[PDB]
């Protein structure tokens, strides 16, 4: 309460920390009578996934494929309906109110990422298109049909509003730069599934494929390791000065990696697919994963 659903949906999709350490959990019902979704807030992360001990909650019309923070209050959401939703918290952060819900994609919106500025963001859909959004004006600035298949993951550049990555089932990894007349650029194997920029190095990123392999790549011009047995669902760097790379998969296992992609930590705690991971800014050693088993597993990474 207040004005929030009693039962949270089974399949936990997204998990993100903001600066002060409140946990944003997004969820879909991927089976049963009603195929809806929901957005949640946990100022006590240890209380999750218990519904009664949460700060805020709200019902969405359709399921949640991906979400992300917009600074400290806003919540950008990728819907099944073919729409990017923006939800903003109220004054006391008790309610979660919808700011807009623009139906622009023709298929499920799969991936979403906020740009360096914070006034704009980018989405990726099963309709093949990638759209750059203005969050103030609530409109599509540009609409790009670069790929020839479903857009699997898009990842905004950390410090450059123009630059971002995208990957798709057409086997392309596009480096974008909206200042060029032709903004997309093909970098270059099995289909690329997840993307993550290096937080310190602007010219370096990592990508996971569908065959359970994470690879380190420089924009100019290669190291890789067989981490997982199945598809790499997500790649999240830690907040440390020399950061560690968390890697998720459909084999139901977490793996934290070093600079040269060697196995430091392993966890087979989840019984279903591990969907999203996030590092606490209060304690950098902790790591929170969520999965379709409806677990919120708080790990202790040895560093």
């Amino acid at each position: 309460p207040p004005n929030a659903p009693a039962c949270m949906e089974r399949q936990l999709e997204a998990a993100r920390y903001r600066s002060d350490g409140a946990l944003l959990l997004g969820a879909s019902s991927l089976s049963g009578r009603c195929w809806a979704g929901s957005l949640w807030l946990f100022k006590d992360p240890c209380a999750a996934p218990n519904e009664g001990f949460c700060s805020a909650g709200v019902q969405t019309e359709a399921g949640v494929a991906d979400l992300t923070w917009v600074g400290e209050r806003g919540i950008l959401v990728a819907s099944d309906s073919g729409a990017v939703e923006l939800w903003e918290l109220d004054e006391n952060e008790t309610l979660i109110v919808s700011k807009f819900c623009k139906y622009e994609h023709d298929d499920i919106v799969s991936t979403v990422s906020v740009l360096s500025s914070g006034t704009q963001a980018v989405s990726g859909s099963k309709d093949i298109c990638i759209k750059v959004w203005d969050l103030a004006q609530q409109v599509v600035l540009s609409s790009y049909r670069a790929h020839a298949a479903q857009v699997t993951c898009v990842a905004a550049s950390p410090h450059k509003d123009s630059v971002f990555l995208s990957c798709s089932e057409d086997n392309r990894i596009l480096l974008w730069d909206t200042r060029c007349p032709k903004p997309a650029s093909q970098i270059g194997g099995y289909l690329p599934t997840s993307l993550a920029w290096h937080p310190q190095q602007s010219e370096v990123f990592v990508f996971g494929d569908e065959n359970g392999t994470v690879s380190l790549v420089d924009t100019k011009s290669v190291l890789s390791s067989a981490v997982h047995s199945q598809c790499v669902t997500g790649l999240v760097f830690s907040p440390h000065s020399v950061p560690f790379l968390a890697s998720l998969s459909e084999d139901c296992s977490l793996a934290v990696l070093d600079s040269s992609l060697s196995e430091l930590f392993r966890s087979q705690a989840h019984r279903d697919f591990v969907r999203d991971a996030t590092w606490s800014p209060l304690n950098h050693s902790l790591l929170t994963t969520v999965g379709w088993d409806h677990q919120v597993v708080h790990h202790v990474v040895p560093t």
């Binding site: 009603c34 195929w35 099944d80 073919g82 049909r145 670069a146 598809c231």
Partner: protein, 622 residues
């Protein structure tokens, strides 16, 4: 009324979705039967031991709603031709699971994608599902006119889109469909859901889908333009494609989210449906019989039924041409000074129920010349109708003769012999043999109406008509007998691959010391498209007298001859034909004392077997 459906990839509440879709005005809903992001493990623990339920209950709609209102959609993650063995094996199990749950609900159709070249393992699993249980459901292969790769925005810097014309390359999506249906052995349950893009390809790419079993046409909301008032509309070129699909009576699916900001889209298809080129007299009477295979009639061997003669007689334009041919002939034979003296001996050979007898009497009145009629008729049932007409109306002027024209001993010779012994392939009812035996009682300067007739052949592509023929395998005969015989058919969903050329000609009277009605003809057809040859359409022309003619050849077709459909000579194996290559067909007319029959063979661009050798599968009875 246009049959139309909604395509959604997002269904929160199945009952509330249909209610909104019903109020919008769609007849059915395409939707996922399992949630499209709900990926499923089958081999590896611990993901395979997931607690259920795996999807929605079947009790959420009535059995009637599943049978009519719902169309299944294969989940987008299912990729049976993935390069990774694990994704390949999970996709196989997930595809059978979803297809078997569609069969459990009893859905009328199920949508599978064709979005890449190699769909081989996808075809195998569907073929496995088709041969599992006696259930009968449709499978709509979702395939676009142009692939996503070939219509993408030119925005990748180091990978630019090709501006050169690739002729075979631009038709690649047809090859995706052809390879898939060929692997599944031309199953009648596998049809096309053709998806239209914002920019259409060249005509040859669209013409590539002529003859194909298109059961649906998917129209994205993104392809619609906007008019001044703000409503969703389509371009002139898109409207031209819709008028072709409305003739194939496809179910128009709408996909995507509302850009014109929903019945506005569907109400536009209704506006095009009303405002079309109107239904002509040929297409009006031909409604129902589109691509319906029938045995060609044999009025010599068989006695035609009363309604078959009624069908022939419902054609006043064709008999007014026969009236004109007799009118012009009587003036040329009898001069004005010999009007009351010279009485001409007309002989209607094969008079049926006396339509030519009446046309001959009406011709004599307008010509102002005296005549003497002989209604010769073999079928003794039709003679009952003639003799009731002869007693009640005609009187002694018409002498009815219940006889075969080849056997009949005439009391006097004929000045003119009128006949209507022509089929859709001209000589396929044996008019040559019939008039040859009736020639002895024609006078030395006697006229035949018709005096001349010629058959025409044209190569056609229709994978639909190929399947219609393939489905005529009968129980107590050669299993490929259906391919070695002609069929009278209103050809509708087909592609004429070359202009028709003349095959066999016959002249009457035949004043030759040695009469041979057997023929051999080699034709060569230039083909300017990529296609598949499935058979040869047959038409005919005839000269009744001088310039008065009848024709069912499309380019020189006679007015209002609605009932007369063309003939079809199929082949056993469909032949691939490239752009530029020549279809060389061979046709024989053969006979003994007992039977007349056609044989035929393709010799280029590849060789077929000789069809119907010694009339083993088809004979026309003398």
């Amino acid at each position: 009324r246009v049959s139309s459906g909604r395509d959604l990839n997002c269904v929160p509440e199945i009952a509330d979705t249909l209610g909104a879709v019903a109020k919008q005005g769609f007849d059915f809903l395409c939707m996922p039967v399992f949630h499209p992001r709900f990926k499923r493990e089958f081999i590896q623990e611990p993901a395979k031991n997931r607690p259920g339920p795996q999807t929605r209950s079947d009790l959420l709609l009535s059995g009637r709603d599943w049978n009519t209102l719902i169309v299944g959609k294969l989940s987008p993650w299912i990729r049976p031709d993935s390069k990774v063995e694990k994704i390949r094996r999970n996709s196989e199990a997930a595809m059978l699971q979803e297809l078997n749950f569609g069969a459990y609900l009893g859905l009328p159709a199920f949508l599978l994608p064709l979005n890449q070249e190699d769909n081989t393992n996808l075809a195998r699993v569907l073929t496995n599902h088709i041969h599992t249980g006696h259930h009968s459901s449709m499978f709509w292969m979702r395939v676009p006119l142009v692939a996503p790769e070939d219509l993408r925005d030119d925005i990748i810097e180091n990978a630019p889109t090709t501006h050169t014309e690739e002729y075979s390359g631009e038709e690649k999506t047809w090859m995706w469909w052809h390879n898939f249906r060929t692997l599944c052995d031309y199953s009648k349950r596998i049809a096309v859901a053709l998806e239209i893009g914002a920019d259409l390809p060249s005509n040859h790419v669209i013409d590539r889908w002529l003859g194909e079993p298109i059961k649906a046409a998917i129209l994205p909301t993104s392809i619609f333009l906007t008019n001044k008032k703000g409503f969703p509309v389509l371009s002139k070129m898109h409207q031209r494609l819709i008028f072709r699909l409305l003739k194939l009576e496809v179910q128009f699916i709408i996909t995507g989210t509302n850009h014109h900001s929903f019945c506005s889209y569907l109400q536009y298809l209704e506006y095009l449906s009303q405002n079309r080129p109107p239904p002509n007299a040929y297409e009006l009477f031909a409604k129902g019989y589109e691509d319906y295979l029938q045995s060609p009639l044999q009025p010599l061997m068989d006695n035609l039924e009363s309604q078959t003669y009624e069908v022939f007689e419902k054609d006043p334009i064709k008999y007014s041409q026969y009236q004109q041919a007799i009118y012009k002939c009587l003036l040329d034979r009898v001069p004005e000074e010999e009007k009351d003296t010279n009485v001409q001996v007309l002989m209607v050979l094969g008079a049926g129920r006396g339509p030519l007898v009446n046309a001959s009497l009406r011709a004599a009145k307008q010509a102002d010349r005296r005549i003497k009629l002989y209604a010769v008729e073999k079928n003794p049932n039709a003679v009952v109708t003639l003799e009731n007409w002869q007693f009640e109306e005609w009187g002694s002027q018409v002498t009815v003769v219940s006889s075969d024209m080849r056997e009949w001993v005439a009391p006097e010779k004929a000045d003119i012999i009128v006949s209507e012994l022509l089929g859709s392939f001209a000589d396929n009812e044996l008019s040559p043999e019939c008039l040859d035996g009736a020639q002895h009682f024609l006078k030395d300067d006697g006229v035949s109406i018709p005096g001349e007739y010629t058959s025409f052949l044209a190569p056609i592509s229709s994978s639909k008509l190929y399947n219609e023929v393939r489905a005529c395998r009968e129980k107590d005969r050669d299993p490929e007998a259906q391919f070695e015989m002609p069929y009278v058919v209103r050809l509708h969903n087909f592609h004429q691959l070359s202009a028709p050329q003349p095959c066999f000609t016959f002249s009457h009277p035949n004043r030759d010391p040695m009469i041979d009605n057997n023929r051999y003809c080699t034709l060569e057809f230039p083909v300017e498209v990529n296609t598949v040859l499935h058979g040869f359409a047959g038409y005919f022309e005839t000269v009744l007298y001088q310039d008065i003619t009848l024709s069912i050849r499309p380019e020189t077709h006679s007015p209002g001859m609605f009932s007369w459909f063309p003939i079809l000579f199929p082949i056993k194996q469909p032949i691939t034909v490239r752009e530029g290559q020549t279809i060389c067909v061979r046709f024989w007319r053969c006979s003994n004392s007992k039977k007349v029959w056609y044989e035929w063979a393709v010799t280029a661009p590849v060789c077929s077997a000789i069809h119907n050798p010694t009339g083993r599968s088809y004979t026309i009875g003398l």
